[PDB]
Design a binder for this molecule. Structure first.
Ligand SMILES: Nc1nonc1-c1ccccc1
Ligand SMILES: Nc1nonc1-c1ccccc1
Lengths: 546, 546
């Protein structure tokens, strides 16, 4: 019974094989066949390449030794190497061209999801080249998906030496018959085969996955499109900034590059961005996913006025100040989307670019009280129910698991009537006590929200809705302005409250506005359609937040 | 009795005045005198510029209105504006050229140090230009040094309107006679003068500071060179990463740009880098100042083997992995310096560049046990005293204030004999029970270290010295390597343990090594000579960590 899968890197998890360039270079330069592959393997276990792979020397020290081997081979073959011959240039280009073998990575992800222990076992080097970051980035993207990474240069052992296989088995805490081992080099397969491991010689990926599927009894080929990588809260870097004596803001941080500040809505968490954080960080951004004021590990003062937009925006400016950031891209959803438009209006110098999911930008009407304006739209009745301090807190805090399971549903899973909420007497009046789990969330994800809301409950979050008059007076000061910094509005076809139609006049105030639109998407955009959200945001960031 | 100082921005804290370009542009383009300064002030309180300064419109909306005013003025004056005339280009260049008036900022810093409440009061705009970041950076660098920043566009009021002065006084919680108000515009001085505030018309900085010195009775001109900006722990962003089940690492984080990981020595803190963190972040780097394993808010497991260099380095690689960083520049001092050389040797792909303060790189001698090697140098006797578990812990933990005050001293303040420490029976045997405060530290700084060491004490920190044999065996695997990534070695003339001479052969192993050297500098480099450390590191980072 197999319970562990081991993959090689070159030619298996990453393609084209860096090894493959030697044959290509020979052909392109009309050199005798196998000359470069000979200089490379020269001296076998005692040679320069084995010393490199065991970590005795670095890649930069290996380059002149490989150069020396190339001549010795050329001299024997009675051929002259071309004038401008460069081993450094050949290897720089080969390493740079090598990319993750996405269907192979998908198969490894599926096996791990099914309970398999997975590992990468590779003959690799200590890379000190000026361009080493490209390879460091590839190794980082890949290794996060595996239980173990065993590199020859770190362990002082190489394949096909028998000791590295015993080392692999000791690491896996598994007997050989429990291991599938995948490799593109026949010679490197034999010792694993000799120990009784299941072995797969990898030439083309489809056949290798067919053999892997047949031997494990798990569907790996032709599978449905997987979800983007999520976040495990315990594996994240957690940051904490005091913005004023009684208020601290918590955030999760991942990646390098331009700062991207993600701002969740009601009643959410930094974790509502779980599918976006790894994707945006891998796309070359430094993601700061906030617990907004009133939520999770951030402070939750009880006063209603602590949650007016002016105060919330001022604190987000202080947050940037304390972190030493002159700007960040601000991306918001729901109440977070309203905050990001106001950050763009009041602090354009601190906003690199702005994007909202679902929340439109509608200028305040100075001739209508916000109380009057909310009353006009029947879908906003729940906002009237949220006004009286304590009423909605009591209902939302009674049973947390029920609250989150009732709220977080796809457009075809509704359990609530967002209609005549006050008259009905609550959001959950004709709602099940034990709602079924939505296709959008796991029980584990629901329990994370439950755990977060046990600290402060719903007072602070509900207070975001209790500053209508104050927010209206503040917003009226901005009526003569336009948003002229880069902006993106993302509508969700099936959000029945923040309907796409509400965004129809935004170009009057944001003339250069860019758009995205997601079909068959409800209110909970990030978790409803994470793949599409990621595609839209990454495309926009790369073109406009540059 | 004055207790508050208020400074204008344009022409006072920042020069050349953005206003000053109008006169310059007129002269350069041979336009009639004062034409551009007329189009700018056109319509007075009802005009486009006052609307901009009150925050009614943004700078990008103001540009075509100023353009319209420029023509109306030119038409009246019977002159034609040059063909390629651009208000945007003129203002972009003027804003970009404006820099902090360093002696004015120094005076404000000195007044605050002496107990004054300080503020910036400025007529400014909402900047939505594509180049707005330059100004955001300037405002960030400046505002951190003041109690208040009052911007006309945020308060909807402008100087010389009387309400902004009453608003300033309300903000300062001071009566007018308690306020010195500095401005370069005569008209903007009068309302403050009318209320009874002390006013300084600023033309040239020296005269303005002479008037300021005379009126406050505090020396501001000709003062000694100030120390670099320090860190207030409560104002920093604090980060926490779990690198393994029982181990979390704490760090302070400031700035944007390439990641720079600062690694302190024994028995220190992230706070040992307090003078470097603001300087490096302002120089365009993202600083991550660590609490090393065993210290401060980082985990401190009791096992000796948790502190061998192999384990410590592996955890720092995991730290980068969890933060989503493919590389960081690694800068170390003392034990932190030893760690950074080993990061360069074992993980060059993760090290953008490496720098050490005081700690040299000396390859392990495979023919001498580390016990034998340490014995040879009498200055390393204290390391032998640290070997026996519990002995040095008891002495160092007996009185924390005494420990830190005895250790942290400049080269001419020695209170300890680092000689025959074991034979003597401890580091503090012939040491005062109440050492005098060193010129290097405040009582407040000593108490921060005391507070940090109350959590875990000295077991984990001392364990860094208890892995000699293990570190030697690991280091021997790297003997065939060279450090070929960018490297900087900084020696300190008066470090009597890590003497500059010990670094003399480093070029044999690091051929491209760059150097720095600090005269009259003891062991505690960062706090002994912070200005020189900052100058050396910033110069090197800008040329080599690019
Ligand atoms: N309460 C309101 N009426 O109009 N616009 C608002 C508003 C303004 C800013 C933030 C949130 C809401
Ligand atoms: N303990 C030792 N002998 O030589 N070199 C070392 C060493 C190696 C790595 C880190 C710290 C010390």
């Amino acid at each position: 019974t197999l319970r562990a899968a081991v993959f090689d890197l070159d030619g298996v998890l990453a393609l084209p094989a860096v090894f493959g360039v030697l044959g290509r270079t020979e052909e392109a330069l009309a050199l005798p066949r196998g000359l470069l592959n000979d200089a490379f393997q020269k001296g076998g276990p005692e040679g320069a390449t084995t010393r490199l792979m065991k970590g005795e020397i670095t890649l930069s020290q290996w380059i002149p030794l490989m150069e020396e081997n190339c001549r010795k081979c050329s001299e024997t073959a009675k051929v002259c190497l071309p004038k401008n011959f460069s081993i450094k240039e050949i290897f720089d280009k080969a390493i740079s061209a090598r990319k993750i073998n996405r269907p192979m990575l998908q198969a490894a992800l599926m096996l791990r999801k099914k309970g398999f222990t997975t590992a990468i076992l590779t003959n690799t080097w200590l890379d000190d080249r000026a361009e080493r970051d490209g390879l460091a980035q590839l190794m980082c993207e890949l290794k996060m998906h595996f239980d173990f990474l065993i590199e020859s240069c770190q362990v002082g052992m190489v394949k096909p030496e028998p000791q590295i296989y015993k080392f692999l088995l000791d690491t896996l805490k598994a007997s050989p018959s429990e291991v599938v081992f995948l490799d593109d080099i026949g010679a490197n397969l034999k010792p694993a085969r000799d120990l009784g491991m299941v072995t797969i010689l990898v030439q083309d990926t489809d056949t290798a996955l067919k053999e892997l599927e047949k031997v494990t009894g798990i569907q790996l080929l032709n599978t449905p499109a997987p979800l983007p990588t999520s976040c495990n809260p315990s594996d994240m870097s957690h940051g904490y900034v005091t913005v004023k004596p009684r208020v601290r803001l918590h955030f999760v941080e991942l990646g390098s590059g331009p700062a991207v500040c993600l701002c969740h809505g009601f009643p959410e968490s930094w974790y509502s961005w779980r599918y976006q954080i790894p994707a945006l960080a891998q796309a070359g951004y430094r993601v700061l996913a906030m617990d907004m004021k009133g939520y999770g590990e951030s402070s939750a003062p009880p006063e209603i006025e602590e949650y007016c937009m002016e105060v919330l925006c001022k604190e987000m400016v202080t947050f940037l100040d304390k972190l030493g950031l002159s700007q960040a891209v601000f991306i918001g959803h729901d109440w977070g989307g309203m905050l990001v438009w106001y950050m763009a209006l009041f602090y354009p110098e601190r906003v690199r670019a702005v994007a909202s999911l679902n929340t439109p930008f509608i200028p305040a009407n100075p001739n209508m009280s916000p109380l009057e304006s909310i009353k006009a739209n029947p879908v906003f009745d729940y906002q009237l129910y949220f006004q009286e301090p304590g009423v909605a807190e009591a209902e939302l805090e009674q049973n947390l698991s029920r609250t989150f399971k009732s709220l977080f549903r796809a457009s075809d899973e509704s359990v609530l009537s967002m209609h005549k909420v006050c008259e009905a007497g609550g959001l959950f009046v004709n709602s099940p006590e034990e709602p079924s789990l939505s296709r959008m969330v796991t029980e584990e994800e629901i329990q994370f929200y439950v755990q977060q809301f046990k600290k402060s409950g719903f007072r602070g979050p509900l207070n975001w809705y209790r500053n209508m008059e104050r927010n209206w007076k503040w917003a009226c000061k901005s009526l003569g302005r336009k948003i002229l910094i880069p902006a993106l509005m993302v509508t969700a076809e099936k959000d029945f409250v923040l309907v796409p139609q509400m965004s129809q006049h935004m170009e009057d105030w944001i003339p250069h506005l860019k758009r995205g639109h997601i079909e068959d998407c409800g209110h909970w955009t990030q978790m409803d359609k994470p793949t599409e959200v990621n595609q839209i945001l990454i495309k926009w960031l790369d073109s406009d937040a540059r």
